[PDB]
Amino acid sequence: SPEEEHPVKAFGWAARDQSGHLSPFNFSRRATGEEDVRFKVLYCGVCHSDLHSIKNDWGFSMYPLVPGHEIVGEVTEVGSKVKKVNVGDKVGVGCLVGACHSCESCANDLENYCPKMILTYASIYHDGTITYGGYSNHMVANERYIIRFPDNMPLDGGAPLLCAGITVYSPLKYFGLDEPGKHIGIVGLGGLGHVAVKFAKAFGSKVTVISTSPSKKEEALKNFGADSFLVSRDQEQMQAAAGTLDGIIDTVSAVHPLLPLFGLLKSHGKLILVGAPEKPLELPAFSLIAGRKIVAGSGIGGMKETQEMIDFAAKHNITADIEVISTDYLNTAMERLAKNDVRYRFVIDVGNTLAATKP
Amino acid sequence: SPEEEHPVKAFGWAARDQSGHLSPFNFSRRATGEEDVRFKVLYCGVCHSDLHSIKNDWGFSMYPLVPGHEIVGEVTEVGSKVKKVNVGDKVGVGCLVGACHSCESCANDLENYCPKMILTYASIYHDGTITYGGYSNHMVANERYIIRFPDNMPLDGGAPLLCAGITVYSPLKYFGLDEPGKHIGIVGLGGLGHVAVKFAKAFGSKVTVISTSPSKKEEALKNFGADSFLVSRDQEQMQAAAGTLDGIIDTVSAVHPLLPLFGLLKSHGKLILVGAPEKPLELPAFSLIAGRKIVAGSGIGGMKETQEMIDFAAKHNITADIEVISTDYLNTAMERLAKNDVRYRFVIDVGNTLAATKP
Numbered sequence: 001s002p003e004e005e006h007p008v009k010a011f012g013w014a015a016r017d018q019s020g021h022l023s024p025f026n027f028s029r030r031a032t033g034e035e036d037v038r039f040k041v042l043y044c045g046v047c048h049s050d051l052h053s054i055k056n057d058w059g060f061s062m063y064p065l066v067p068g069h070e071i072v073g074e075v076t077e078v079g080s081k082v083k084k085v086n087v088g089d090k091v092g093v094g095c096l097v098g099a100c101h102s103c104e105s106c107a108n109d110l111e112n113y114c115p116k117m118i119l120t121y122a123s124i125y126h127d128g129t130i131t132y133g134g135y136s137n138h139m140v141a142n143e144r145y146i147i148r149f150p151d152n153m154p155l156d157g158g159a160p161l162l163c164a165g166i167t168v169y170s171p172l173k174y175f176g177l178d179e180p181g182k183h184i185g186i187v188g189l190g191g192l193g194h195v196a197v198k199f200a201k202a203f204g205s206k207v208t209v210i211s212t213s214p215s216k217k218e219e220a221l222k223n224f225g226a227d228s229f230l231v232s233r234d235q236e237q238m239q240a241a242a243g244t245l246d247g248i249i250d251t252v253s254a255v256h257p258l259l260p261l262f263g264l265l266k267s268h269g270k271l272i273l274v275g276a277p278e279k280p281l282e283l284p285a286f287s288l289i290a291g292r293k294i295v296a297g298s299g300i301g302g303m304k305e306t307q308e309m310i311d312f313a314a315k316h317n318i319t320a321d322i323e324v325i326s327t328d329y330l331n332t333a334m335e336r337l338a339k340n341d342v343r344y345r346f347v348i349d350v351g352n353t354l355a356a357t358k359p
Numbered sequence: 360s361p362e363e364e365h366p367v368k369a370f371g372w373a374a375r376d377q378s379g380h381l382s383p384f385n386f387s388r389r390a391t392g393e394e395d396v397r398f399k400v401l402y403c404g405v406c407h408s409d410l411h412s413i414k415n416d417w418g419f420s421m422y423p424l425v426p427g428h429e430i431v432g433e434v435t436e437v438g439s440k441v442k443k444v445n446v447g448d449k450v451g452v453g454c455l456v457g458a459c460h461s462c463e464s465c466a467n468d469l470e471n472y473c474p475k476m477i478l479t480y481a482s483i484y485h486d487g488t489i490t491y492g493g494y495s496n497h498m499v500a501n502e503r504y505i506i507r508f509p510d511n512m513p514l515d516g517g518a519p520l521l522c523a524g525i526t527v528y529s530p531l532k533y534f535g536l537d538e539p540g541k542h543i544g545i546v547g548l549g550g551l552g553h554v555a556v557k558f559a560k561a562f563g564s565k566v567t568v569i570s571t572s573p574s575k576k577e578e579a580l581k582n583f584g585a586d587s588f589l590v591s592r593d594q595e596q597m598q599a600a601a602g603t604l605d606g607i608i609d610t611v612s613a614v615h616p617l618l619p620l621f622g623l624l625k626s627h628g629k630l631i632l633v634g635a636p637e638k639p640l641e642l643p644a645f646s647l648i649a650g651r652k653i654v655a656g657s658g659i660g661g662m663k664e665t666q667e668m669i670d671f672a673a674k675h676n677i678t679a680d681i682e683v684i685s686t687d688y689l690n691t692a693m694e695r696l697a698k699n700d701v702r703y704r705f706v707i708d709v710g711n712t713l714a715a716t717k718p
């Protein structure tokens with residue numbers, strides 16, 4: 001059983017089948033090694049990936065499954081060789097917890113692109129055991145995967161930056177869309193979406209938000225500072241913005257029309273897919289061929305950059321607009337997420353609400 | 360009527376409806392302007408795009424339509440402002456005959472990416488008249504769009520370089536796949552494919568040919584010099600070559616699986632689509648996200664690069680493997696092309712067989 005698998009006892013909420021239903025779950029985590037760092041989970045943002053996983057949208061999920069990879073907390077214990085963190089420090093873990101550490105991806109600081117990269121949850125760790133997420137009391141990871149929380153960065157509103165944040169930030173840099181004056185487009189004003197707008201503006205880019213929810217317009221223009229708002233379903237409106245974007249970050253979590261998006265790209269424009277629909281997308285070759293445009297994909301970021309991201313976010317006072325919930329509210333939160341009903345990001349107040357849920 | 364439109368009488372073969380039936384057609388062309396170069400058509404390769412066009416695969420097609428954009432002939436006349444071609448010179452005309460000549464892509468020798476770019480056939484010229492291609496007797500184009508054939512370049516075997524040639528050459532240079540060490544892949548050993556292989560080998564690159572016709576394995580390996588042949592519909596075969604290509608030039612003229620191509624690509628590898636399928640292709644986001652891979656589009660090339668491409672081919676003894684046909688064989692050749700039954704390139708011998716078809 002999972003309660004006997006490791007020495008130190010653990011508690012959290014897990015799904016047992018593709019119904020995605022979460023409920024108290026008893027498990028355990030490995031003992032704290034020389035390079036590991038142990039910390040009490042204070043907060044953990046709810047990412048749409050946690051939803052896809054528990055519902056088995058990709059048919060990769062193995063149960064029981066404990067989601068959560070936007071973890072934030074307080075260090076309690078650390079191994080003898082730990083160097084950058086002490087007990088009492090505020091730290092966080094993202095979507096990565098390990099890799100092979102020897103290929104060229106790792107050496108170049110891209111543990112996220114290692115063929116043996118280990119995901120924070122629903123993956124197989126170096127010891128062959130199933131990895132469990134941040135929807136739990138405590139966490140333990142190698143110092144290399146431990147992010148340091150700047151002192152002026154709130155523990156709850158900065159949590160989603162660990163995944164949603166690093167994920168949109170990374171592509172804006174790598175594809176040269178973090179240049180002032182440039183015109184960037186963010187498809188889907190959701191978790192990753194609204195964070196992107198914030199980094200894009202922070203870089204000094206004129207920003208266009210492409211959404212299916214006209215009731216987010218005002219918030220997009222007036223709170224996130226987007227310079228333009230487009231309802232992807234209104235062709236007259238879309239067509240007007242034809243060839244105005246140097247690049248686009250697509251965070252859409254479901255299959256959706258790509259043609260219209262290309263139509264918004266200037267010549268040689270770039271479409272960066274970051275969202276993960278359960279099914280294949282429709283790509284019209286002439287959309288690429290006409291203009292020599294490209295469609296690229298990006299997944300989170302390596303550990304190094306993830307750190308550069310939170311530091312940057314803390315300097316510019318960038319944070320996720322969140323809604324703090326109780327552990328026992330997880331099921332309702334998940335349906336609300338599936339139904340586009342969260343004003344950007346749910347974050348679980350694990351510290352003050354997890355314990356009370358044990359039978 | 361097309362024969363009254365202009366002052367100089369022309370003759371060729373056109374399609375009148377989407378059945379694609381080609382037959383004699385009487386039209387005309389504008390008079391030789393100050394910067395124009397007039398020439399007698401001697402040859403005209405047959406590109407699959409001609410077939411798509413005449414069957415209206417892309418819905419754009421308009422009739423009557425005269426295909427042909429791999430035109431080679433002898434200059435019969437030149438305006439007073441022509442600088443590099445004299446009467447009697449061997450010239451070529453590719454997919455372009457015009458453009459705005461007053462924007463960034465044109466100013467950067469990318470007439471092909473100009474929004475007002477003009478296609479050799481089925482497009483509207485600067486004088487607002489429809490353009491008819493190379494399946495005709497004579498031809499006339501502004502000096503800018505005239506390719507000067509190199510002395511050591513056969514007119515018939517070099518005709519397809521004017522389109523098939525530049526289309527695979529451009530991406531090879533633009534996406535950095537033009538150098539030894541790079542392991543390149545070419546999908547679809549057809550008109551553009553076999554030529555794509557030659558340029559590739561010429562650049563010193565190692566090459567992998569992905570085909571659906573096992574009976575081409577030898578011509579590819581022994582004659583083109585491919586370092587490896589793969590049968591797309593062979594799991595075990597394809598599987599083995601996973602993650603071994605720095606980039607791929609996809610020339611397929613129809614819908615086909617993409618997942619297998621991303622499978623062959625290395626981390627950060629590039630898939631370059633040059634084939635113009637009729638329907639969109641399936642694109643699983645994970646394939647790109649998994650290893651930050653790219654899917655780019657590319658169409659022919661700029662005038663400057665086209666001239667360079669053929670000068671490169673000449674120095675490297677590169678020509679298309681063709682099959683010369685009489686004009687009256689057009690409909691049979693069109694049926695054979697559609698059935699992937701041409702050992703690389705049908706080339707109309709216009710200079711010796713058109714006139715004999717004029718009623």
Ligand SMILES: NC(=O)c1ccc[n+]([C@@H]2O[C@H](COP(=O)([O-])OP(=O)(O)OC[C@H]3O[C@@H](n4cnc5c(N)ncnc54)[C@H](OP(=O)(O)O)[C@@H]3O)[C@@H](O)[C@H]2O)c1
Pocket residue numbers: 046047048049050052163164167187188189190191192193210211212213216251252253254255256274275276277298299300301337340344648
């Ligand atoms: N590759 C990576 O590294 C990585 C990292 C994190 C997350 N992801 C993936 O990114 C996606 C988004 O996660 P979130 O950002 O966590 O999700 P979310 O908050 O649910 O936001 C998704 C946003 O997209 C739009 N959307 C939803 N359904 C849509 C539909 N049928 N058609 C068009 N637009 C739709 C909505 O925006 P509008 O109201 O503006 O339309 C929705 O606000 C998920 O697939 C997740 O798995 C990938």
Ligand SMILES: NC(=O)c1ccc[n+]([C@@H]2O[C@H](COP(=O)([O-])OP(=O)(O)OC[C@H]3O[C@@H](n4cnc5c(N)ncnc54)[C@H](OP(=O)(O)O)[C@@H]3O)[C@@H](O)[C@H]2O)c1
Pocket residue numbers: 289405406407408409411522523526546547548549550551552569570571572575610611612613614615632633634635636657658659696699703
């Ligand atoms: N974007 C541009 O600038 C540009 C320029 C010129 C042409 N094109 C387009 O490029 C394509 C190829 O033109 P060609 O090179 O002129 O055509 P082609 O000679 O017909 O060659 C196409 C080659 O692809 C493969 N093929 C055909 N049907 C297939 C299918 N259902 N599944 C998998 N492979 C298939 C065959 O190769 P195997 O026997 O090896 O499978 C065929 O030899 C056309 O769509 C054309 O319109 C684009």
Ligand SMILES: [Zn+2]
Pocket residue numbers: 047048049050069095163164
């Ligand atoms: Zn996530």
Ligand SMILES: [Zn+2]
Pocket residue numbers: 099100101102103104105106111114115116117
């Ligand atoms: Zn590695």
Ligand SMILES: [Zn+2]
Pocket residue numbers: 406407408409428454522523
């Ligand atoms: Zn062509």
Ligand SMILES: [Zn+2]
Pocket residue numbers: 458459460461462463464465466470473474475
């Ligand atoms: Zn132009």
